[PDB]
Amino acid sequence: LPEELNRVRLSRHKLERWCHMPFFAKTVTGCFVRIGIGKPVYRVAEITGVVETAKVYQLGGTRTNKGLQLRHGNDQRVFRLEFVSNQEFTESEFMKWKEAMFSAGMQLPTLDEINKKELSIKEALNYKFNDQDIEEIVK
Amino acid sequence: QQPMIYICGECHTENEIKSRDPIRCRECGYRIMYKKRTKRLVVFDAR
């Protein structure tokens, strides 16, 4: 179902809050983003690792030069944080991702994994920043 | 679900401070920072 898949769908307005929050390779790795290819076609790519680009680009007010290790089944490449869509997972793109995963040999992540993964985001949001994260954030 | 937003001194950037937080700006580092105007009804008599 592309509806349950949208709960772990990472929109564009949520990355801006966590451009400098650590544990980043532990909350976002396992969710799905709506990245752009381009003309209005989209593919569901997999947040695999946390990479950094040597291109610093501004996203509205904020700027971030990092990358995202995304992959659509087998086609994997680098990605920046501006081409992601706030659009939810549609039906044609959900089935397209399903066919890219059935076509690649990757197992579809079980729904219980998505249910245990979607709560990591809400706990990371209400997280009290009592430790030394403000300091590294300003740096 | 309102996080008590402050305005920095030297930055002029809105920060979100909830309780039990250090008062510091999310950037540049500033210990002084001010509060935003109210949302209530301000009505004056031009008098």
């Binding site: 929109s11 564009r12 307005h13 381009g38 003309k39 081409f83 869509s85 706030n86 | -």
Partner: peptide
């Protein structure tokens, strides 16, 4: 105040660059 998109802010494409 979680995702106030209301669509969006003209999402830039990857094959546009």
């Amino acid at each position: 105040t979680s995702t106030y998109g209301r669509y969006g802010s003209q999402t830039p494409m990857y094959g546009s660059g």
